[PDB]
Amino acid sequence: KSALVTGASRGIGRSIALQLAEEGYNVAVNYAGSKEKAEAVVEEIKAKGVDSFAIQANVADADEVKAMIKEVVSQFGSLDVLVNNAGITRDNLLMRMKEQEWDDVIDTNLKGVFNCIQKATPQMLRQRSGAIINLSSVVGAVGNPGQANYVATKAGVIGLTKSAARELASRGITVNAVAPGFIVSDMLSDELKEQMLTQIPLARFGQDTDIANTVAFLASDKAKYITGQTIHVNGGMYM
Amino acid sequence: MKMTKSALVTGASRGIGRSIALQLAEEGYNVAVNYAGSKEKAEAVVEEIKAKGVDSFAIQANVADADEVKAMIKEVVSQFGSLDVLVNNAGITRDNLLMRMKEQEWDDVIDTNLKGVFNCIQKATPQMLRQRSGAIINLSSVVGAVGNPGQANYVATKAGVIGLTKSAARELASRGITVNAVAPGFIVSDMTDALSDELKEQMLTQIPLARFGQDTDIANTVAFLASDKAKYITGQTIHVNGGMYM
Amino acid sequence: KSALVTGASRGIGRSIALQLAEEGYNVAVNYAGSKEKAEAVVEEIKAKGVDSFAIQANVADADEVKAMIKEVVSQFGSLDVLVNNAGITRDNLLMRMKEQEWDDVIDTNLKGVFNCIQKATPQMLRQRSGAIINLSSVVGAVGNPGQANYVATKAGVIGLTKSAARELASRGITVNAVAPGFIVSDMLSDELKEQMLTQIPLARFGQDTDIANTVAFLASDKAKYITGQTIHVNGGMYM
Amino acid sequence: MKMTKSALVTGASRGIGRSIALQLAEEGYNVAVNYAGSKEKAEAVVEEIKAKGVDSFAIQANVADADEVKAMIKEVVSQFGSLDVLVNNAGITRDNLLMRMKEQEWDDVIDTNLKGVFNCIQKATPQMLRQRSGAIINLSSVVGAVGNPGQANYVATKAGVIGLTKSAARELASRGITVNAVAPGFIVSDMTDALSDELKEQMLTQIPLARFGQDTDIANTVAFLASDKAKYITGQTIHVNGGMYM
Ligand SMILES: [Mg+2]
Ligand SMILES: [Mg+2]
Ligand SMILES: [Mg+2]
Ligand SMILES: [Mg+2]
């Protein structure tokens, strides 16, 4: 069994890769930025006793994504789990937001998930199996001032999740999303943090591992009847 | 008669956009009719609107183009003196199976449907902040909430529009502006009718009221959200779909 | 056209009745408590140029509700709009909540809506038309400490709304709900109110008329294709 | 082997409740098996559970009865020393068309399904506050989210259970307790099979995965929520339904 995680060089992506490796998956580590950080994650994954390698690719670019999937399948022999975790923010108030701030976030976060799903589908259709897990965010469900672009993409990812789920269900593929709340890795002044904590019933920020554990559950045989769903992992801030 | 309040409707040359424009006119709004291609259809709608006794004119703009949208808003505010209601109705489809969908089919739908809504909201914002009032109503779709095979691009945009609705709602609320969405179900005017009766039959089985909806059903809900009757409603998506999604 | 509004002697119920009367509806005013307050509402309604009368009935009691509907139909000739607005709270923390605090709220708020819908259905089926509008609450969607009973009923009312909508749609009846946020009539220290205001994007409490306007829209020909829906009227506190 | 952690499952003598109990046992929880009527079935499940290597016993209680529930919780805490997981699975149906449904059909379903869940949560609360930890998982249903003709009572309770889930979640969060719900779709064990294949065919058309689910699908999700893997998930309803509702 083989998995690919996008934007896996650090934070939630890395934790996801490490957890999948803990479950017995071979894991390909996609990255955009630092090679050495990605290579370190690959070594951490190998320490779990599975195979791993890093692949550089901009998920916004359909050609690069196609080459990425082809390499994973070439190397691992299959593609059983795809985790679309890569994402960026370029925050600004509505009136101040630049066109490139919109475009960059939409192409990376929304088109990137589409690209990865699209390029992975032919392999999964031939397998007649697969699990795709997309990362959304609590703000995709509730909105947030200053992030109109990011919110649009994470809500859009939920819609894409549902559509892909309905389209691919007949061929044995599940498609789900995980929406983190306020997670320590993603983390500000202690004053701002204090206010954010008042929004959270559990009264603490979540950890990378909370997100990774949920993704791993969705990628497992234990979740084979779950599809089209968004699992909110947010300490109760949105219910 | 030039009304004290004015509306802009995007993609208003036919179907749902046209009925919305006509309904806003009936409610006493001057209405600007935006169109992309067919000027003749837009100008006929303008005449229908003036027959209601309000002012109207047609404006050509591609909503995906930030600069055309800015010029469009400036022209509406210039002609009418304000922009009290913005209805983001313009949208296209480029349907295809996931594994076949062309990059251009994805891009065009995202730019018109999602970026278009962002552009219109962004460019309208300064005027509405100046007014300390306004209503923005965005058109989504039932498929934005439930997904639909063959429409992954369109679905992504209509879900994205609901997100954008909530974000703009939170950002603009404190200055007196509401932002909401309406999600039509299966509406007769959105159908080519090229599809067989058996396909119609199947779609009808999804709808408890066992009929397709009409443009006016959507228009009436938009007009409600655009009225003082709905001043405490914001960030909401109103589904008008005969019960097919609850 | 004839309407019945439960718990209409004051607050949101009264405002709803007055608005329906403004729309040309004859309106029956159901009440549980003070007769003179209800009679005053009936006079206010008559001032709009429509017919009106008050009926005493505990909505938790199926016999009394049956007699209530029968009287409305007898008097008006039909029952075109039913607004289930009657509801109570008996707040307490989970560990402190008494059995009667649970039972009273469930029977009034949830069984009461069921009773009214059930007893109204035979008339509406014979008409092959009608609009039923149930009152929920933002807390039905988000929960609230100290109101486990109330929350259960208002979420339950949403479920009942959907089920009735699906069951009655084929006979020309729509069934919808309206969920108010924090409304001035329902209203505390200015300190508590200040905190509640921080939960509301519009930064103000809503008014009875906001709820009444939405109910009136749902009861009108303009909403004939809307059914099974919950309309949140809450200034953006829940989206 | 007596585990360090213990679970109570209501209505666990068969179907979904039984699979949940067995799955929790496999995860290393001592499991108490609650039943209302059939003691023989409950005791057989107890033996299946002990075969997994954990402790188990059967307890009779009507969940609608606050006093029986209190005695039940006391007995579990007494036997096991704690109550770390509470699964509120017990529930009944009394189906009928709206205009025909008997008052007793409404009352019995509300008392068992909705009041029963409240009673169990209320009586478990003191022990879990004492522990400063615990997981409560409530069983809802897809029909709680979408409605279903002929089940207005059952639907009201399953929607009510989601509300109760969110309210208890908010109230208990600060003291280390999570409260979530699982909403099964159409599961083979919930069907009498008395229904025709054509009725089955129709139900299958609502499900993208084009198969009914199994008890184990529900059990696995409950076990996930009951684990340390889900400590930051609270107030949520997880739909396990093959895509029929998204
Ligand atoms: Mg024409
Ligand atoms: Mg559109
Ligand atoms: Mg047996
Ligand atoms: Mg149950």
mmCIF file of all heavy atoms in Angstrom, chain B residues 65-82:
data_model
loop_
_atom_site.group_PDB
_atom_site.id
_atom_site.type_symbol
_atom_site.label_atom_id
_atom_site.label_comp_id
_atom_site.label_asym_id
_atom_site.label_seq_id
_atom_site.Cartn_x
_atom_site.Cartn_y
_atom_site.Cartn_z
ATOM 1 N N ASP B 65 -13.055 39.807 -15.021
ATOM 2 C CA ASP B 65 -12.086 40.871 -15.264
ATOM 3 C C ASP B 65 -12.241 41.998 -14.232
ATOM 4 O O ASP B 65 -13.186 42.780 -14.290
ATOM 5 C CB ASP B 65 -12.281 41.409 -16.685
ATOM 6 C CG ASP B 65 -11.147 42.312 -17.141
ATOM 7 O OD1 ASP B 65 -10.787 43.254 -16.405
ATOM 8 O OD2 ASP B 65 -10.622 42.080 -18.252
ATOM 9 N N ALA B 66 -11.312 42.069 -13.282
ATOM 10 C CA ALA B 66 -11.377 43.050 -12.197
ATOM 11 C C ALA B 66 -11.564 44.493 -12.695
ATOM 12 O O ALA B 66 -12.325 45.268 -12.110
ATOM 13 C CB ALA B 66 -10.132 42.944 -11.317
ATOM 14 N N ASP B 67 -10.872 44.850 -13.776
ATOM 15 C CA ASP B 67 -10.963 46.206 -14.329
ATOM 16 C C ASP B 67 -12.314 46.523 -14.985
ATOM 17 O O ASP B 67 -12.825 47.638 -14.865
ATOM 18 C CB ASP B 67 -9.816 46.462 -15.309
ATOM 19 C CG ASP B 67 -8.479 46.601 -14.602
ATOM 20 O OD1 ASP B 67 -8.374 47.461 -13.706
ATOM 21 O OD2 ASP B 67 -7.544 45.838 -14.926
ATOM 22 N N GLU B 68 -12.891 45.553 -15.681
ATOM 23 C CA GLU B 68 -14.223 45.759 -16.242
ATOM 24 C C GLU B 68 -15.251 45.872 -15.120
ATOM 25 O O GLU B 68 -16.196 46.660 -15.200
ATOM 26 C CB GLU B 68 -14.598 44.634 -17.214
ATOM 27 C CG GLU B 68 -13.730 44.623 -18.473
ATOM 28 C CD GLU B 68 -14.227 43.657 -19.542
ATOM 29 O OE1 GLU B 68 -15.390 43.199 -19.463
ATOM 30 O OE2 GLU B 68 -13.449 43.355 -20.471
ATOM 31 N N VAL B 69 -15.070 45.076 -14.072
ATOM 32 C CA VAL B 69 -16.001 45.126 -12.950
ATOM 33 C C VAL B 69 -15.911 46.474 -12.252
ATOM 34 O O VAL B 69 -16.927 47.056 -11.863
ATOM 35 C CB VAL B 69 -15.767 43.990 -11.953
ATOM 36 C CG1 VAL B 69 -16.637 44.196 -10.701
ATOM 37 C CG2 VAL B 69 -16.079 42.647 -12.617
ATOM 38 N N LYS B 70 -14.695 46.984 -12.097
ATOM 39 C CA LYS B 70 -14.548 48.272 -11.445
ATOM 40 C C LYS B 70 -15.247 49.356 -12.247
ATOM 41 O O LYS B 70 -15.929 50.206 -11.681
ATOM 42 C CB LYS B 70 -13.079 48.628 -11.241
ATOM 43 C CG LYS B 70 -12.860 50.082 -10.874
ATOM 44 C CD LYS B 70 -11.435 50.314 -10.384
ATOM 45 C CE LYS B 70 -10.402 49.773 -11.362
ATOM 46 N NZ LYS B 70 -10.242 50.633 -12.572
ATOM 47 N N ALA B 71 -15.077 49.325 -13.564
ATOM 48 C CA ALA B 71 -15.717 50.310 -14.436
ATOM 49 C C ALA B 71 -17.235 50.164 -14.394
ATOM 50 O O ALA B 71 -17.975 51.147 -14.464
ATOM 51 C CB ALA B 71 -15.201 50.175 -15.874
ATOM 52 N N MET B 72 -17.695 48.924 -14.279
ATOM 53 C CA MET B 72 -19.124 48.648 -14.209
ATOM 54 C C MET B 72 -19.750 49.256 -12.964
ATOM 55 O O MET B 72 -20.791 49.898 -13.044
ATOM 56 C CB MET B 72 -19.380 47.140 -14.221
ATOM 57 C CG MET B 72 -20.811 46.768 -13.883
ATOM 58 S SD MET B 72 -21.119 44.851 -14.102
ATOM 59 C CE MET B 72 -20.032 44.208 -12.658
ATOM 60 N N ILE B 73 -19.119 49.033 -11.814
ATOM 61 C CA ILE B 73 -19.613 49.575 -10.551
ATOM 62 C C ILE B 73 -19.611 51.110 -10.576
ATOM 63 O O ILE B 73 -20.558 51.756 -10.118
ATOM 64 C CB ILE B 73 -18.760 49.095 -9.351
ATOM 65 C CG1 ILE B 73 -18.825 47.569 -9.197
ATOM 66 C CG2 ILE B 73 -19.209 49.796 -8.068
ATOM 67 C CD1 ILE B 73 -20.212 47.017 -8.852
ATOM 68 N N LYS B 74 -18.540 51.692 -11.106
ATOM 69 C CA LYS B 74 -18.449 53.144 -11.177
ATOM 70 C C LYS B 74 -19.584 53.702 -12.017
ATOM 71 O O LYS B 74 -20.159 54.742 -11.694
ATOM 72 C CB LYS B 74 -17.108 53.574 -11.762
ATOM 73 C CG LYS B 74 -15.906 53.190 -10.909
ATOM 74 C CD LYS B 74 -15.541 54.294 -9.926
ATOM 75 C CE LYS B 74 -14.214 54.018 -9.235
ATOM 76 N NZ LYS B 74 -13.849 55.115 -8.296
ATOM 77 N N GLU B 75 -19.912 53.006 -13.099
ATOM 78 C CA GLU B 75 -20.974 53.468 -13.986
ATOM 79 C C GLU B 75 -22.355 53.352 -13.329
ATOM 80 O O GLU B 75 -23.210 54.221 -13.500
ATOM 81 C CB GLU B 75 -20.919 52.737 -15.332
ATOM 82 C CG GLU B 75 -21.964 53.200 -16.343
ATOM 83 C CD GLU B 75 -21.748 54.631 -16.834
ATOM 84 O OE1 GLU B 75 -20.634 55.177 -16.661
ATOM 85 O OE2 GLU B 75 -22.700 55.211 -17.399
ATOM 86 N N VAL B 76 -22.578 52.283 -12.572
ATOM 87 C CA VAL B 76 -23.837 52.140 -11.852
ATOM 88 C C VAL B 76 -24.014 53.232 -10.798
ATOM 89 O O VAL B 76 -25.065 53.869 -10.718
ATOM 90 C CB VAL B 76 -23.969 50.758 -11.166
ATOM 91 C CG1 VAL B 76 -25.243 50.709 -10.338
ATOM 92 C CG2 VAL B 76 -23.946 49.643 -12.199
ATOM 93 N N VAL B 77 -22.988 53.440 -9.982
ATOM 94 C CA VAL B 77 -23.044 54.471 -8.955
ATOM 95 C C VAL B 77 -23.207 55.842 -9.599
ATOM 96 O O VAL B 77 -23.928 56.706 -9.094
ATOM 97 C CB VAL B 77 -21.797 54.436 -8.051
ATOM 98 C CG1 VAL B 77 -21.796 55.622 -7.099
ATOM 99 C CG2 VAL B 77 -21.729 53.103 -7.280
ATOM 100 N N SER B 78 -22.548 56.046 -10.733
ATOM 101 C CA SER B 78 -22.676 57.318 -11.427
ATOM 102 C C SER B 78 -24.109 57.555 -11.912
ATOM 103 O O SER B 78 -24.696 58.615 -11.661
ATOM 104 C CB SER B 78 -21.684 57.402 -12.592
ATOM 105 O OG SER B 78 -21.720 58.685 -13.183
ATOM 106 N N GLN B 79 -24.677 56.564 -12.593
ATOM 107 C CA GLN B 79 -26.010 56.707 -13.190
ATOM 108 C C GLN B 79 -27.129 56.798 -12.161
ATOM 109 O O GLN B 79 -28.069 57.582 -12.316
ATOM 110 C CB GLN B 79 -26.299 55.538 -14.137
ATOM 111 C CG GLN B 79 -25.568 55.613 -15.452
ATOM 112 C CD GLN B 79 -26.085 56.742 -16.331
ATOM 113 O OE1 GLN B 79 -27.233 57.173 -16.194
ATOM 114 N NE2 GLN B 79 -25.237 57.230 -17.234
ATOM 115 N N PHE B 80 -27.030 55.984 -11.116
ATOM 116 C CA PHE B 80 -28.089 55.848 -10.127
ATOM 117 C C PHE B 80 -27.814 56.632 -8.842
ATOM 118 O O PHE B 80 -28.731 56.925 -8.083
ATOM 119 C CB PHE B 80 -28.277 54.364 -9.764
ATOM 120 C CG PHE B 80 -28.874 53.529 -10.867
ATOM 121 C CD1 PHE B 80 -28.777 52.145 -10.835
ATOM 122 C CD2 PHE B 80 -29.546 54.122 -11.923
ATOM 123 C CE1 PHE B 80 -29.346 51.364 -11.849
ATOM 124 C CE2 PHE B 80 -30.108 53.350 -12.938
ATOM 125 C CZ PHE B 80 -30.008 51.967 -12.895
ATOM 126 N N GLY B 81 -26.549 56.936 -8.578
ATOM 127 C CA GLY B 81 -26.192 57.673 -7.379
ATOM 128 C C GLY B 81 -25.879 56.797 -6.176
ATOM 129 O O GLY B 81 -25.425 57.288 -5.141
ATOM 130 N N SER B 82 -26.128 55.498 -6.299
ATOM 131 C CA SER B 82 -25.806 54.569 -5.221
ATOM 132 C C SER B 82 -25.801 53.126 -5.719
ATOM 133 O O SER B 82 -26.150 52.852 -6.864
ATOM 134 C CB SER B 82 -26.807 54.721 -4.064
ATOM 135 O OG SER B 82 -28.108 54.291 -4.444
#
